[PDB]
Amino acid sequence: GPSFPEPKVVRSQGGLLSLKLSATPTPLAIAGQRATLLTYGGSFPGPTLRVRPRDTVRLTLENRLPEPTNLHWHGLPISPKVDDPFLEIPPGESWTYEFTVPKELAGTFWYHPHLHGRVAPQLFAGLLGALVVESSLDAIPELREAEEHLLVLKDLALQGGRPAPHTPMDWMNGKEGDLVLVNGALRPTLVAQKATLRLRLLNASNARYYRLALQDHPLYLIAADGGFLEEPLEVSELLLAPGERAEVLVRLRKEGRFLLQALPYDRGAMGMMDMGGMAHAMPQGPSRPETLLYLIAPKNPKPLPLPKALSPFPTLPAPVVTRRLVLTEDMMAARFFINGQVFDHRRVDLKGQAQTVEVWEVENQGDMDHPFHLHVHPFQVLSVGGRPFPYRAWKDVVNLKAGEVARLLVPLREKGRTVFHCHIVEHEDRGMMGVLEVG
């Protein structure tokens, strides 16, 4: 096959993407070994669904797992009557998700389980895939002539040829694995044929962070989680927290081999030590550096000019309400809270009005990073930690380091009951989630 492994793509046909997937235990070859993973469509990652605005998606999920499951269409601004976080598909049963792709939408999205209490083990075991919304913007020469690839960043740990079980410490920290993979492959080689690459990046890990840096090169950020920036933004590195997506252009500067690395990053994970008094909690510190892939540049590379502009960001109405949400931890109990409470599916926490805009101030009073996610209603990050955000784009996950406040502009779109939660999915399973009702 191609030197660079990417998931199989399924495209809409005549404006319709009609597909049956089964969530199933699946024997595979993974990183040179044989293992049984939980997969959609018999692959890890699952197939990439590629659609255009106004397409109809009709996806029948058959549950062939021994436990209930469901889907979350992460990042899609569709109705929570479709993207229903409370729905349970029992073992052996099927459910059809049907929705229309919104008109004003572009970018990289993804699908994964969201059955409360069961997300972390199901996602860890391999249940994920990408969804790409194509854009008329993809036709501009500076993007059309770039070489495009999807990078699904997901780590894994295996024990006895199956995903490693969660330990108590894993429920506290979020589980990370020693196999740090791209598209389910261990350190693949990308032999570029063009001097400009357009990389769509997805962090589909439970808890691992990727502080991305390409040796000797900057990255040009052109999209965040849920849409394009207004113009490319040059960055030296790019942190991708769990659940986040980005698209970057890479302009290869000379012939050679360049490592794409996940550089050391301390997200505040904890360990335990006993030094004669003790036992107490002690910081794990930064992650060890990882090589993600080897990027080979072509001969005499002459990158395309960057796009001068991408997509203008919508002018939003003045906001009608300010919310303040506070995240806290009880680490030794592996319990996690929003405004002092754990999730209760019967309890509505926030009530808002459709087609109004809210300001959400999300404050991390814990010591760990927490990547905050809101379903259904993409937001504009205004500032984090008191620093203004350097671009305007739609996001649906925002990382908060210890002590930081994120200020979000949140237009409320579809009516109904939905959720917001930490996307370290162990923390969501352990209570860090709340309910928003839009009417």
Closer residue to ligand OH in complex, CB, 61/221: 61
CA–CA separation, 115 and 88 (whole Å): 7
Closer residue to ligand OH in complex, CB, 114/395: 114
Instruction: Consult the annotation and say whether 421 binds a ligand.
Output: yes
**Out of 400, 422, 435, 436, which residue is the one contacting Cu ion (CB under 5 A)?**
422
* Cβ neighbourhood burial of 381 (10 Å; 0-12, 13-18, 19+): buried
381: tokens are 């990050």
**Out of 190, 424, 435, 436, which residue is the one contacting Cu ion (CB under 5 A)?**
424
Instruction: Consult the annotation and say whether 149 binds a ligand.
Output: no
**Out of 175, 208, 251, 373, which residue is the one contacting ligand OH (CB under 6 A)?**
373
Least distance between Cu ion and beta carbon 360 (Å): 16
Residue 377 touches which of ligand OH, Cu ion, none (CB < 5 to 8 A by kind)? none
Closer residue to ligand OH in complex, CB, 190/436: 436
Residue 427 touches which of Cu ion, ligand OH, none (CB < 5 to 8 A by kind)? Cu ion
**Out of 37, 47, 49, 74, which residue is the one contacting Cu ion (CB under 5 A)?**
74
Residue 118 touches which of ligand OH, Cu ion, none (CB < 5 to 8 A by kind)? none
Task: Report the site for ligand OH in 406-435 (rule: CB under 6 A).
Answer: 423
- What secondary structure letter does DSSP report for 89? B
Task: Determine how many CB atoms are found less than 10 A away from the CB of residue 18.
Answer: 14
Contact 401, 371 (CB under 8 A): no
**Out of 38, 43, 72, 232, which residue is the one contacting ligand OH (CB under 6 A)?**
72
Least distance between Cu ion and beta carbon 421 (Å): 5
Cis peptide bond prior to 279, omega within 30° of 0: yes
Least distance between ligand OH and beta carbon 358 (Å): 20
Task: Report the site for Cu ion in 313-372 (rule: CB under 5 A).
Answer: 370
Task: Determine how many CB atoms are found less than 10 A away from the CB of residue 409.
Answer: 16
CA–CA separation, 393 and 222 (whole Å): 9
Residue 52 touches which of Cu ion, ligand OH, none (CB < 5 to 8 A by kind)? none
Instruction: Consult the annotation and say whether 166 binds a ligand.
Output: no
Task: Report the site for Cu ion in 191-250 (rule: CB under 5 A).
Answer: 243
CA–CA separation, 214 and 260 (whole Å): 4
Q: Is residue 154 part of the contact set for ligand OH (CB under 6 A)?
A: no
CA–CA separation, 210 and 106 (whole Å): 23
Least distance between ligand OH and beta carbon 116 (Å): 10
Least distance between ligand OH and beta carbon 345 (Å): 14
Q: What are the distances in angstroms from CA 56 to CA 41, 60, 256, 283? A: 20, 13, 44, 48
Which residue shows structure tokens 């209490």? 117
Instruction: Consult the annotation and say whether 422 binds a ligand.
Output: yes
Q: Is residue 114 part of the contact set for ligand OH (CB under 6 A)?
A: yes
**Sign, Cα dihedral of 417, 345, 124, 29:** negative
Could you tell me which of 411, 404, 313 has the C-alpha nearest to residue 359?
411
CA–CA separation, 200 and 421 (whole Å): 24
User: Residues touching ligand OH: how many (CB under 6 A)?
Assistant: 5
Closer residue to ligand OH in complex, CB, 115/252: 115
CB neighbour burial string for 187-214, b if at least 16 within 10 angstroms, e if fewer = ebebebebbbbbbbbbbbbbbbbbbbbb
Q: What are the distances in angstroms from CA 242 to CA 44, 237, 370? A: 18, 16, 9
Closer residue to ligand OH in complex, CB, 123/137: 123
Least distance between ligand OH and beta carbon 37 (Å): 20
Binding residues for Cu(2+): 72, 74, 112, 114, 280, 370, 373, 375, 421-423, 427
Q: Which residues would be at the binding site for ligand OH (CB under 6 A)? A: 72, 74, 114, 373, 423
